[PDB]
Amino acid sequence: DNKLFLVYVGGTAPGANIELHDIRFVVGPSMEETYPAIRKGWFGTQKGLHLDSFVHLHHVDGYRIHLTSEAPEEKRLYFVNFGYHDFTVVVADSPQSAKQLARAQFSVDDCLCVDLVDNHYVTLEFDGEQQPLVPDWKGYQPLPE
Amino acid sequence: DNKLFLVYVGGTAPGANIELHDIRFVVGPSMEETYPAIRKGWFGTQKGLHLDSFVHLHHVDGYRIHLTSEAPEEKRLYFVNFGEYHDFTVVVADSPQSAKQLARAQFSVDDCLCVDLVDNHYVTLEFDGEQQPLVPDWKGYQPLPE
Numbered sequence: 484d485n486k487l488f489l490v491y492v493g494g495t496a497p498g499a500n501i502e503l504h505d506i507r508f509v510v511g512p513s514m515e516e517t518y519p520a521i522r523k524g525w526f527g528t529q530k531g532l533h534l535d536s537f538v539h540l541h542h543v544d545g546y547r548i549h550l551t552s553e554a555p556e557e558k559r560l561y562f563v564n565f566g567y568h569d570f571t572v573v574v575a576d577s578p579q580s581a582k583q584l585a586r587a588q589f590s591v592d593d594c595l596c597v598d599l600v601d602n603h604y605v606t607l608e609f610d611g612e613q614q615p616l617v618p619d620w621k622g623y624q625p626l627p628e
Numbered sequence: 629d630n631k632l633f634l635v636y637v638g639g640t641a642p643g644a645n646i647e648l649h650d651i652r653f654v655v656g657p658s659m660e661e662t663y664p665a666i667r668k669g670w671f672g673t674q675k676g677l678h679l680d681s682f683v684h685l686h687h688v689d690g691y692r693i694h695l696t697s698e699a700p701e702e703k704r705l706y707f708v709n710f711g712e713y714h715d716f717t718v719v720v721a722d723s724p725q726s727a728k729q730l731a732r733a734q735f736s737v738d739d740c741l742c743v744d745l746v747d748n749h750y751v752t753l754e755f756d757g758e759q760q761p762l763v764p765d766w767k768g769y770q771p772l773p774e
Contacts, residue, residue, distance in 0.1 A: 495739075496641070496671060497671065498650075498669075498670075498671025498672075499648075499650045499671045500650055500651050500652065500653075500707070500709065500741060501649075501650055501651050501709045501715070501716065502709060502711065502739075503644075503648045503649070503650070504646075504648070505644050505645055505646055505648070506645050506646050507645065508645075524643075525643075526641055526642065526643035526644050533711075562645070564645070564646045564647060566638070566647050566678075566769075570646065593647075595645055623711070
């Protein structure tokens with residue numbers, strides 16, 4: 484059973500004075516099997532690359548996330564970064580409606596469509612379940628070599 | 629009269645999903661006169677680069693910072709990155725080893741950088757006993773011009 488993980492990773496990059504951090508979406512049966520995909524998703528230096536937090540995402544806005552190898556869809560998963568507090572994940576039909584829904588959850592941004600991840604398609608099903616967007620785990624976990 | 633600024637800048641880089649941030653050290657008479665050096669020190673994509681916070685750094689651990697065109701110093705300025713400015717500090721030390729030690733002790737494997745040459749200006753230190761809190765002069769969102 485493949486799972487979708489939102490992963491927050493940290494490391495160095497050439498030119499930079501401090502540690503940088505990025506959010507990756509990866510798919511695997513477990514976290515350790517996503518390690519190759521985390522490493523190649525990471526833009527910076529591989530030496531010292533570490534996991535800071537992650538969450539297995541199964542539900543967003545009442546929608547269950549399904550993953551299939553093959554897969555038309557009405558609504559899609561959108562990740563919205565504000566230039567877990569500084570980002571969100573929403574379900575919407577358009578990139579513009581995704582940004583607006585993201586603005587309304589607080590009380591010019593950038594968004595990514597999460598629809599194809601490590602050769603797996605993201606399809607959504609309404610079922611009513613909520614999932615708090617909080618880490619399953621946080622800390623400092625270096626990836627192996 | 630040149631000033632040493634520590635600037636917190638933000639923007640994008642190829643392959644990254646979110647906005648990234650770096651700390652730069654820059655030298656100029658004013659903040660706006662450091663913009664070329666900020667742009668050329670930024671590791672990522674130029675388009676959309678913005679300044680988020682900065683501080684004019686004049687004193688660290690009782691030492692006054694002097695900036696000169698021409699340059700032996702026993703103690704030096706060290707910037708220490710830990711693995712509001714909470715995730716890092718600046719200290720005065722003789723060696724990178726002792727720099728890391730002093731940085732650890734003032735909270736209650738890391739990386740450190742020696743800040744002795746910045747934009748063709750040498751950093752020299754003079755003990756005068758003055759303190760300066762390592763906090764921003766300004767914070768917000770300021771796009772750098774093109």
